[PDB]
Amino acid sequence: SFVRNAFTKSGNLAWTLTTTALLLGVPLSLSILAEQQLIEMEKTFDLQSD
Amino acid sequence: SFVRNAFTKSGNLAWTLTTTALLLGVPLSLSILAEQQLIEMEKTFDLQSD
Amino acid sequence: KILTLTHNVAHYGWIPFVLYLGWAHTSNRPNFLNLLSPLPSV
Amino acid sequence: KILTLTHNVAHYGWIPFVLYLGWAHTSNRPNFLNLLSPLPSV
Amino acid sequence: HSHRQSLELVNPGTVENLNKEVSRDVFLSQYFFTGLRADLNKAFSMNPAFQTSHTFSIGSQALPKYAFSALFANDNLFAQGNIDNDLSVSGRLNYGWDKKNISKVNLQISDGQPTMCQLEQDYQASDFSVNVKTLNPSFSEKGEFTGVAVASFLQSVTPQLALGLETLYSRTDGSAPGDAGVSYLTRYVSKKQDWIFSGQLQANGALIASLWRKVAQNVEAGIETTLQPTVEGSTTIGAKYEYRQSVYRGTLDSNGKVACFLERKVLPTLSVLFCGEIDHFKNDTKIGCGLQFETAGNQELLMLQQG
Amino acid sequence: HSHRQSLELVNPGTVENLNKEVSRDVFLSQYFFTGLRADLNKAFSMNPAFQTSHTFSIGSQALPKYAFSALFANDNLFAQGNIDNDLSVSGRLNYGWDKKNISKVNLQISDGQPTMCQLEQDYQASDFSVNVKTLNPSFSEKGEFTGVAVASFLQSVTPQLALGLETLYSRTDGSAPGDAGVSYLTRYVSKKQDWIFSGQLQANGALIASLWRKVAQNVEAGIETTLQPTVEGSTTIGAKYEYRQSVYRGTLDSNGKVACFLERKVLPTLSVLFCGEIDHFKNDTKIGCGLQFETAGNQELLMLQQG
Amino acid sequence: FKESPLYTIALNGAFFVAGVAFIQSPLMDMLAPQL
Amino acid sequence: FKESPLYTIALNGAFFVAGVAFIQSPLMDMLAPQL
Amino acid sequence: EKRAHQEQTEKTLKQAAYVAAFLWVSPMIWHLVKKQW
Amino acid sequence: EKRAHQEQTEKTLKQAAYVAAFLWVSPMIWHLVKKQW
Ligand SMILES: CCCCCCCCCCCCCC(=O)OC[C@H](COP(=O)(O)OCCN)OC(=O)CCCCCCCCCCCCC
């Protein structure tokens, strides 16, 4: 019936949305995390220098 | 002549060995470099704590 | 005919039997939405 | 076969011409093997 | 019987564990894949083990598009279920009557193909390991078994050498006769556990010989050998570099190919992993990348995971 | 004359750089690839730039298996030579008579197909930019031109807006009349240079309209729409995240495909990079990984690179 | 219900205008991380 | 000049003995990093 | 047949030159328009 | 025809059982040998 069609359409759109979101976000997550780690390391270097 | 065939064979084998070497080395080199950096930072933390 | 009746119910219901038993053994016993959600929002 | 000579020269000598210019304008002026080597052996 | 205990013999490993330390630890055959893969598994309980898993994949033949799963492992019972898109259902149940005797049942239905289930019964005594596997057991109207039967026995001759057999009986329909096969297994563990040899001679004529060496606490190396008239062979050498940040596995093949598998643990939870393979006799490549995001379901377990 | 200088116009960039900010700087069309790729470039002299480069690749159709190249660049001259396996030499030579007038010649052989060359003459005045390019010039026995020529002009009507045209004449053989096509170009720059807009109508009926925005000092974004009876259109929206350690470019398309490209500089010399694209209209993926190794040629530059 | 080339031209133009509004809007400013 | 299955089994056997001699030798001990 | 093609190519080039000249003179006309308003 | 395969299979199984029993008792013969050593 229409219930099965709605279910499969919703599942497929959820799957594609999740794949796009994580594929575009995980590189962002790791690059931004590395940048933040470097910034904090630099800040503690300044703190220990002064 | 034989010179061209020898040159082609030598170049092809050099290409294969070089690509194998770098494919099996670059992941290894980056992993060991990250480990060495982590060990150095841990040693620095230990010496500043002591 | 018993096996034919079981064919669909067991198919659809092997998974949430395990889910229910784990939920019963779970200390805090979260709800169904938390159980299926991959977020750590608890 | 002067025509074929120049035809093959225009192919085999364009890279050596650039290398010659780079070697002449550089200060260290290394040898050909080090010029063609990707190693940092300097 | 008293002199049996007087020999201080030790229990040999299971037959499935005969060459686990090479074909699973050092080599990347079971870990390799292709294309992109994301694994999203979360843990709800530890002391009674209970955790779920979502798996998204794309571009890989072996893996499906989406697969959900959930497992529970208590002190003696182990149950696992897996539901896959197109609604394929897999289930595993291991029940331990005792630390020595264990029963297992594996069920798999593809929803359009006949259900395939296998019954496992294993017993690991103080000196010998025996097990029996039944694939699609069935009895004819005359009372004759129809299916696949495997019965394997491994006995430790000396605390450094174990020798054993594995017999298999096949009865596809009952009208066609059931074939029988016998294979030999041998395992030599070093006196100091530094290196291991393991050789199997199967009933079809193929021979498998593997050697494993623990170079250091962080490095392992191994050679595996397979050879099946029509006779073809293969020899694969490999190494595993295990660290406290990342793991690396690299193998050369006698068929002129090279492989690499590097799992890089960027975060205590998130862990990226890359794998590549170059085939020189055909000059092709195979690339796969993916992530594992191991999360939690309880706040105290969040604290434990974060430290 | 005097009033022309009193207007106080500025020189707009050439026609080739009209979509520089949104097509090359932000979008990953030029940087994307497939399979594995290793680049190993070393530099000998810096003030007169001189460097060599080796490139290995496997799994990509566009890229060759092995390629070598060298480039030299003094104050007013630029030269580059390239050699590829199957021996297809390429060569580019740009001579700058002044800082404004540049004559450049590009040549590429194919070794089995007709060698193709192009010649460009570029002039950049105080308030307009002109360039004339020819591809495979040839003269018939009657002295008439036979080839492809493109002459483009861009004049800045106001300090914020530039309008221009390009005219292309193609004469394939001379027996068949050559065809002419005129294209219109528009560019707008905000007063604070916050955003750029560009729009060009092509001779083939294609319309390109692209907007670029500088969100912050480390990020920027762009959106581009192209249109081409048979009418087909597409629209891509992308973003760039530049950092001192990594560079990211992401892109959604109206065709349904998403793509990401992350170049991560692990070391001052090494720089790995990954690119991944997923198309949901056929559920397929492309993965590509590679490294760039930058090296010095003399000790002074070697110590300069590290610091 | 037209399903014509005008339909795809209109959809592409609407998508372009919506993207321009989104990019010019402050929403895409907060989308950029502050650091 | 044989080019027979015996030849490929002999080549494989040479591979096995060379590999086991390599691993058991101190060559691979030197190959692994000290850290 | 092709004569009309040559004429239309020639007139396209002619109008291209005309609009190029108009574009070159355009900044002055815009300046005069601004002066008027 | 199939009967021949039947008895071939049963002798294979009996031989497997025999070698299994021999392996089961093997540590005693090995102990005798090491006693001789
Ligand atoms: C449908 C759902 C899809 C899910 C898709 C999910 C995509 C996530 C993929 C993320 C991959 C990001 C790649 C990258 O650049 O990450 C680098 C990563 C970790 O590096 P770190 O940031 O920890 O480095 C710190 C200093 N060592 O390093 C690594 O992980 C190692 C990568 C090494 C690459 C080496 C390439 C080999 C060169 C081959 C050359 C062959 C030439 C013929």
Numbering used by the authors:
A (entry chain J), B (entry chain B): 86 to 135
C (entry chain E), D (entry chain M): 19 to 60
E (entry chain F), F (entry chain I): 49 to 276, 295 to 373
G (entry chain L), H (entry chain D): 27 to 61
I (entry chain K), J (entry chain C): 13 to 49
Copy text from the publication.
As the main entry gate of mitochondria, the TOM complex is responsible for transferring ~90% of mitochondrial proteins from the cytosol into the mitochondria. Mitochondrial proteins are primarily synthesized within the cytosolic ribosome and subsequently transferred to specific mitochondrial compartments through the corresponding translocase complexes, including the translocase of the outer mitochondrial membrane (TOM) and the translocase of the inner mitochondrial membrane (TIM23).
Notably, the density of the TIM23 complex was progressively diminished with the contour level value increasing from 0.08 to 0.16, implying the instability of the TIM23 complex. Numerous efforts were made including substrate screening and modification, large-scale image collection, and chemical crosslinking to enhance stability of the TIM23 complex to generate a high-resolution map, but no obvious improvements were achieved for the TIM23 map. In the architecture of the TOM–TIM23–Jac1sfGFP supercomplex, the structural features of the TOM complex were significantly clearer than those of the TIM23 complex. Moreover, structural analysis of the Jac1sfGFP-engaged TOM complex revealed two preproteins proximity sites (PPS) on the mitochondrial surface. The PPS1 and PPS2 were situated on the cytosolic side of the TOM complex, potentially functioning in recognizing the incoming preproteins. Superposition analysis of the free TOM complex and Jac1sfGFP-engaged TOM complex showed that Tom5 exhibited an ~3-Å movement towards the Tom40 channel in the Jac1sfGFP-engaged TOM complex, suggesting that the Tom5 might respond to the incoming substrates.
